[PDB]
């Protein structure tokens, strides 16, 4: 997730830590607040998607 | 028996004997019914006779 | 579940919930999307299930 969407062409690099919950934490790791950031998963005998 | 469907509603009702008058006004009822587009749609008016 | 208002919102803040996990559905739009139906389903299942 982000704040909003992004203009045309925009780069973003923050890597702080939204808070995906409803109580303000400070921006403290754990529930309510997870990590932006989640990778793909590469398995050569996989679906094509 | 009355069982699987979703719609439950109880209010004023709408046949009331309103003449209270010793006759000479007989209470006309007219009512029309229809559906579109899912909406059912109830008129009346109650008027002397 | 029909013909209500649905504070899902209040559901987020109001008690302390292990996961909220919905699939497909963001939290975000729980106050936005109208639906016609909601299946509400709870019992007591193991941790490890």
Not at chain 1, 11 to 39: H, K, M, W
Not at chain 2, 20 to 30: C, M, S, T, V
């Amino acid at each position: 997730f982000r704040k909003s969407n992004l203009k045309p062409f925009e780069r973003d690099i923050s890597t702080e830590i939204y808070q995906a919950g409803s109580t303000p934490c400070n921006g403290v790791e754990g529930f309510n607040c997870y990590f932006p950031l989640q990778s793909y998963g590469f398995q050569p005998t996989n679906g094509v998607g | 028996s009355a069982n699987n469907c979703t719609f439950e509603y109880v209010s004023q009702p709408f046949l009331m004997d309103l003449e209270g008058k010793q006759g000479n006004f007989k209470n006309l009822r007219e009512f029309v019914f229809k559906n579109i587009d899912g909406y059912f749609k109830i008129y009346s008016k109650h008027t002397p006779i | 579940i029909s013909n209500c208002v649905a504070d899902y919102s209040v559901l987020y803040n109001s008690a302390s919930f292990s996961t909220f996990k919905c699939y497909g559905v963001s939290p975000t739009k729980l106050n936005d999307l109208c639906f016609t139906n909601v299946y509400a389903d709870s019992f007591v299942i193991r941790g490890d299930e």
